[PDB]
Design an enzyme around this catalytic site. Structure first.
Site, PDB file in Angstrom:
ATOM      1  N   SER A  45       0.785  -1.299   0.113  1.00  0.00           N
ATOM      2  CA  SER A  45      -0.019  -0.128  -0.103  1.00  0.00           C
ATOM      3  C   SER A  45       0.905   1.219   0.202  1.00  0.00           C
ATOM      4  O   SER A  45       0.021   2.543   0.073  1.00  0.00           O
ATOM      5  CB  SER A  45      -1.116   0.105   1.034  1.00  0.00           C
ATOM      6  OG  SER A  45      -1.984  -0.931   0.810  1.00  0.00           O
ATOM      7  N   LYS A 209       3.181   6.197   5.142  1.00  0.00           N
ATOM      8  CA  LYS A 209       2.238   5.384   4.684  1.00  0.00           C
ATOM      9  C   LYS A 209       2.797   3.891   4.634  1.00  0.00           C
ATOM     10  O   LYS A 209       3.895   3.918   4.476  1.00  0.00           O
ATOM     11  CB  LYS A 209       1.992   5.677   3.167  1.00  0.00           C
ATOM     12  CG  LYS A 209       1.106   4.520   2.449  1.00  0.00           C
ATOM     13  CD  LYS A 209      -0.474   4.948   2.799  1.00  0.00           C
ATOM     14  CE  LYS A 209      -1.207   3.719   2.668  1.00  0.00           C
ATOM     15  NZ  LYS A 209      -1.468   2.737   3.595  1.00  0.00           N
ATOM     16  N   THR A 210       1.935   3.287   5.488  1.00  0.00           N
ATOM     17  CA  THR A 210       2.231   1.746   5.627  1.00  0.00           C
ATOM     18  C   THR A 210       1.735   0.934   4.356  1.00  0.00           C
ATOM     19  O   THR A 210       0.944   1.040   3.759  1.00  0.00           O
ATOM     20  CB  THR A 210       2.165   1.208   6.990  1.00  0.00           C
ATOM     21  OG1 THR A 210       0.495   1.450   7.155  1.00  0.00           O
ATOM     22  CG2 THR A 210       2.537   1.923   8.069  1.00  0.00           C
ATOM     23  N   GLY A 211       2.183  -0.325   4.520  1.00  0.00           N
ATOM     24  CA  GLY A 211       1.829  -1.360   3.608  1.00  0.00           C
ATOM     25  C   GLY A 211       2.058  -2.819   4.335  1.00  0.00           C
ATOM     26  O   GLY A 211       3.036  -2.996   5.127  1.00  0.00           O
ATOM     27  N   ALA A 212       1.415  -3.668   3.969  1.00  0.00           N
ATOM     28  CA  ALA A 212       1.475  -5.071   4.332  1.00  0.00           C
ATOM     29  C   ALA A 212       0.852  -6.136   3.100  1.00  0.00           C
ATOM     30  O   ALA A 212      -0.025  -5.739   2.188  1.00  0.00           O
ATOM     31  CB  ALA A 212       0.504  -5.314   5.511  1.00  0.00           C
TER      32      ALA A 212
HETATM   33  B1  LIG Z   1      -2.002  -2.408   0.811  1.00  0.00           B
HETATM   34  O1  LIG Z   1      -0.688  -2.807   2.075  1.00  0.00           O
HETATM   35  O2  LIG Z   1      -1.349  -2.824  -0.555  1.00  0.00           O
HETATM   36  C1  LIG Z   1      -3.348  -2.967   1.547  1.00  0.00           C
HETATM   37  N1  LIG Z   1      -2.875  -4.519   1.874  1.00  0.00           N
HETATM   38  C2  LIG Z   1      -3.866  -5.333   1.751  1.00  0.00           C
HETATM   39  O3  LIG Z   1      -5.118  -5.339   1.296  1.00  0.00           O
HETATM   40  C3  LIG Z   1      -3.455  -6.874   2.222  1.00  0.00           C
HETATM   41  N2  LIG Z   1      -4.151  -7.953   1.375  1.00  0.00           N
HETATM   42  C4  LIG Z   1      -3.396  -9.119   0.838  1.00  0.00           C
HETATM   43  O4  LIG Z   1      -2.311  -9.245   1.065  1.00  0.00           O
HETATM   44  N3  LIG Z   1      -4.065  -9.819   0.298  1.00  0.00           N
HETATM   45  C5  LIG Z   1      -3.377 -10.792  -0.718  1.00  0.00           C
HETATM   46  C6  LIG Z   1      -3.761 -11.587  -1.767  1.00  0.00           C
HETATM   47  N4  LIG Z   1      -5.481 -11.403  -2.033  1.00  0.00           N
HETATM   48  C7  LIG Z   1      -5.908 -12.525  -2.577  1.00  0.00           C
HETATM   49  C8  LIG Z   1      -6.892 -12.264  -3.725  1.00  0.00           C
HETATM   50  C9  LIG Z   1      -5.985 -11.055  -0.913  1.00  0.00           C
HETATM   51  O5  LIG Z   1      -7.110 -11.505  -0.551  1.00  0.00           O
HETATM   52  C10 LIG Z   1      -5.483 -10.055   0.064  1.00  0.00           C
HETATM   53  O6  LIG Z   1      -6.196  -9.072   0.418  1.00  0.00           O
HETATM   54  C11 LIG Z   1      -3.422  -7.208   3.497  1.00  0.00           C
HETATM   55  C12 LIG Z   1      -2.471  -7.606   4.408  1.00  0.00           C
HETATM   56  C13 LIG Z   1      -2.658  -7.606   5.583  1.00  0.00           C
HETATM   57  C14 LIG Z   1      -3.716  -7.599   6.312  1.00  0.00           C
HETATM   58  O7  LIG Z   1      -3.810  -7.920   7.731  1.00  0.00           O
HETATM   59  C15 LIG Z   1      -4.958  -7.327   5.452  1.00  0.00           C
HETATM   60  C16 LIG Z   1      -4.742  -6.902   4.167  1.00  0.00           C
END
Ligand SMILES: *[B]([O])([O])[C][N]C(=O)[C]([N]C(=O)N1[C]=[C]N([C][C])C(=O)C1=O)C1=[C][C]=C([O])[C]=[C]1
Ligand SMILES: OC[C@H]1O[C@H](O[C@H]2[C@H](O)[C@@H](O)[C@H](OCCCCCCC3CCCCC3)O[C@@H]2CO)[C@H](O)[C@@H](O)[C@@H]1O
Length: 265
Positions: A45, A209-212
């Site tokens: 993100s 801004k963070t990301g995971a």
């Molecule tokens: B940003 O960091 O880009 C927001 N991050 C997310 O939405 C993360 N989601 C996923 O990693 N994730 C991977 C693959 N798909 C399968 C189609 C997913 O369903 C999905 O949402 C994220 C990371 C960690 C969290 O606790 C929540 C969401």
């Protein structure tokens, strides 16, 4: 705290994963310290800041307005969209979408904005146009978080991301008001900003801004400095670790602590 590079080494050893880091002066681009700064990491993100830089460039060009209200549908939504899911009836302005994308990591807001800049390919073209020849976006939320080993899709390097953030925030490529807007969105982060701010020593500016993502992927792009100044860009990415989210947060915090305690002039 250990010296920054020593802390980073400890983090890699403990995580069994890679850390990428750079600390760069915002005003000049002087690199203070770096680790794996030319290696690729999933943006997750953190890309949302660059996305809204592109949106602001369209506003400056007269091709977009932050006021423009976008009405979208439930079918347009992806997961982790806490703000946009609340506005199916009334819609959201382009500015509100960027605020949601940056401050709440709202995924559907990011996808709606991504379409306005020509999708992942359009955003990558924008990056090339500001002289970033490394960063690339290839997919939409949430697939862009997949973080496969060997996969260059949706990646940046600490050095390229820092240089790009600097260009967006200070290089006068964006208008004065646009530069100010992009920084304010980062100042207003609600995902991690308040927590970080509460544990920073008094006097330290934070915007972020963070990301995971998958396979341990975690990261942060930040403006940080003592004396309440956005002095430096700090980028920290983690990848390819089986560690808990809690440990990944703590390792980034520990690296941050080391950078803060050993802040050079
Ligand atoms: B940003 O960091 O880009 C927001 N991050 C997310 O939405 C993360 N989601 C996923 O990693 N994730 C991977 C693959 N798909 C399968 C189609 C997913 O369903 C999905 O949402 C994220 C990371 C960690 C969290 O606790 C929540 C969401
Ligand atoms: O001597 C220097 C400082 O040492 C401690 O400060 C600690 C603080 O108690 C701790 O909570 C924080 O954790 C750092 C957590 C920051 C959040 C993650 C960092 C992010 C955001 C910024 C850049 C990218 C990483 O470290 C500092 C430095 O040791 C003391 O509490 C403080 O009184 C003193 O001024």
């Amino acid at each position: 705290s250990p010296q920054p590079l020593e802390q980073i080494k400890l983090s890699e050893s403990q995580l069994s994963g890679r850390v990428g880091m750079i600390e760069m002066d915002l005003a000049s681009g002087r690199t203070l310290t770096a680790w794996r700064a030319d290696e690729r990491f999933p943006m997750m993100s953190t890309f949302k800041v660059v996305l809204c830089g592109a949106v602001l460039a369209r506003v400056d060009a007269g091709d977009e307005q932050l006021e423009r209200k976008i009405h979208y549908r439930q079918q347009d939504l992806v997961d982790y969209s806490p703000v946009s899911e609340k506005h199916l009836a009334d819609g959201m302005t382009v500015g509100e979408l960027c605020a949601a994308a940056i401050t709440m990591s709202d995924n559907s807001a990011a996808n709606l904005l991504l379409a306005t800049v020509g999708g992942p390919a359009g955003l990558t073209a924008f990056l090339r146009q500001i002289g970033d020849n490394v960063t690339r976006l290839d997919r939409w939320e949430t697939e862009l978080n997949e973080a496969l080993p060997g996969d260059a899709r949706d990646t940046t390097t600490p050095a390229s991301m820092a240089a790009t953030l600097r260009k967006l925030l200070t290089s006068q490529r964006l208008s004065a008001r646009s530069q100010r807007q992009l920084l304010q969105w980062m100042v207003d982060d609600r995902v991690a900003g308040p927590l970080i701010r509460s544990v920073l020593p008094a006097g330290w500016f934070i915007a972020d801004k963070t990301g995971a993502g998958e396979r341990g992927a975690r990261g942060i792009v930040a403006l940080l400095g003592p004396n309440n100044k956005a002095e430096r860009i700090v980028v920290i990415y983690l990848r390819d670790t089986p560690a808990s989210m809690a440990e990944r947060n703590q390792q980034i915090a520990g690296i941050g602590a080391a950078l803060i305690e050993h802040w050079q002039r």
